[PDB]
Amino acid sequence: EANLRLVISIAKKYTNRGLQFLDLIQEGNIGLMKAVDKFEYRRGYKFSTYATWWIRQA
DNA sequence: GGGTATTCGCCGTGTACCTCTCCTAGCCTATTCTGGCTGCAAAGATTTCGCAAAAATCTGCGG
């Protein structure tokens, strides 16, 4: 819930290139949950960086 | 009470041709390993097609 803004901001870049924005943010939320399930801080990286690639893939 | 007094949606809109093809956009965008699926190549198994060919069969006519 706290990271939905990242999904919205990322998806609005892809909205100008066709496809509904709402579907994009829903898929990005799916990818965000996938990243959350796989996130760790033992790596030392920022969560936003890790979630960015997941959201882009979704 | 009470009677308008606004605003808030919903709906209706002639017929019938013809020519046109015009319909179509960003590009900002990561790597890959394992396993199956499907079209194709190859092999066993099998039926279906034609000539072969001789033997039986069908048909025309004059002595």
Closest C-alpha among A38, A39, A55 to residue A47? A39
Give the position of tokens 């898929």. Answer: A27
Give the position of tokens 């496809």. Answer: A19
C1’ B53 / CA A29, Å: 84
Strand B nucleotides within a 7 Å radius of protein CB atoms:
25-31
Q: By what technique were these coordinates determined?
A: cryo-EM
A12 touches strand B (CB under 7 A): no
A21 touches strand B (CB under 7 A): no
CA gap A58, A56 in Å, rounded: 5
Is-contact A51 A39, C-beta < 8 A? yes
